[PDB]
């Protein structure tokens, strides 16, 4: 996260750090005690193997994410229509081997319902352990920042992303830059508050540079994917 601030304990209790061989690789968002929403570009081969992945919840610092303090991942499911070249349908699910214990530090975020009626420049938050500067290293501390939705019409203009933003993507950030997601934030939450509830509306998907002007962050449009998400959870339960 570029241009944000450190997060307090419990500020973003759905945020998890997803590790490959005990090293942070991607962020994710808790939606049930066992299901985590993340990005499909985090789990392309050979990272489609759940054996590699552990999730860390309720822990703000990478150095406190010890081998054995994490939840082993049992299943990794990428969106069936994920296209890596275009980044289209960039969403995935991870199922944990055992349920999380919800408390003050670990809580789920709500899946968005049809008819949220979000504002064109809805106020949102991003969080993650990504770099705080372009070309920077993974952040030791969980950060978070305020970003605004950017209408897909404006984001697809010739001087921004030039018709690369599909209906499965949403833009957020600032056309003037300075505040953005960055390398290491992939898969993490883009959330918004409405009716006094925090909703998961995006997962950090791609970008060009970090916090550069006319290159805002692009996120998977979670609203489009909820039918697929419910189908996955329903099929798992019985």
């Amino acid at each position, epitope marked *: 996260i570029v241009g944000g601030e450190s997060a307090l304990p419990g500020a973003w209790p759905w945020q998890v750090s997803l590790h*490959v*061989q*005990n*090293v*942070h*690789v*991607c962020g994710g968002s808790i939606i049930t005690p066992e299901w985590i929403v993340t990005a499909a*570009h*985090c789990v*392309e*081969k*050979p*990272l489609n193997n759940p*054996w*590699h992945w552990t999730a860390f919840a309720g822990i703000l610092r990478q150095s406190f994410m010890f081998y054995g303090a994490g939840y082993q991942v049992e299943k990794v499911i990428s969106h069936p229509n994920y296209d890596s*070249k275009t*980044k289209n349908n960039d969403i995935a699910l991870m199922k944990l081997q055992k349920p999380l214990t919800f408390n003050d530090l670990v809580k789920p975020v709500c899946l968005p319902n049809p008819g949220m009626m979000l504002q064109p420049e809805q106020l949102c938050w991003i969080s993650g352990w*990504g770099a705080t500067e372009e*070309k920077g290293k*993974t952040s030791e501390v969980l950060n978070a920042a305020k970003v605004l939705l950017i209408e897909t019409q404006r984001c697809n203009s010739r001087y921004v992303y030039d018709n690369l933003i599909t209906p499965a993507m949403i833009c957020a950030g600032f056309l003037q830059g300075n505040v953005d*997601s*960055c*390398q*290491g*934030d*992939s898969g993490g939450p883009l959330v918004t508050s409405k009716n006094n509830i925090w909703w998961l509306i995006g997962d*950090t*998907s*791609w*970008g*060009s*540079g*970090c916090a550069k002007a006319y290159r805002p962050g692009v996120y998977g449009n979670v609203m489009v994917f909820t039918d697929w998400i419910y189908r996955q959870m329903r099929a798992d339960g019985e």
Partner: nanobody
Amino acid sequence: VQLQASGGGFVQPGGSLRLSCAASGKVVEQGLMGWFRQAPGKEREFVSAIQYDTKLEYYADSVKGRFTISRDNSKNTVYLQMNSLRAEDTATYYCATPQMWVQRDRDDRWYQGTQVTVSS
């Protein structure tokens, strides 16, 4: 962790090469090491990966059976033995960790490698 790939060169079709990946940094961050390659104008392609204990390896379909990935842990060096090379294998070959190869910016280029050319 800092990585330095080497061992590339120019070879004939059917020839062989062996690439090395020297790593410096904490070994606890090298539990999964990978090789990927990129030809001019083409998207980068993942090639192979290996677990630190060598109990698990991975190969892309395009190189399976012809490439072999291995490790020497007394040197923290990852090798890529490339046999039966074809012209379609021409690219720059890089080694990386998952925290490096999983990119929010797909066209970012902070990933230095070794050039491999196959041509008669």
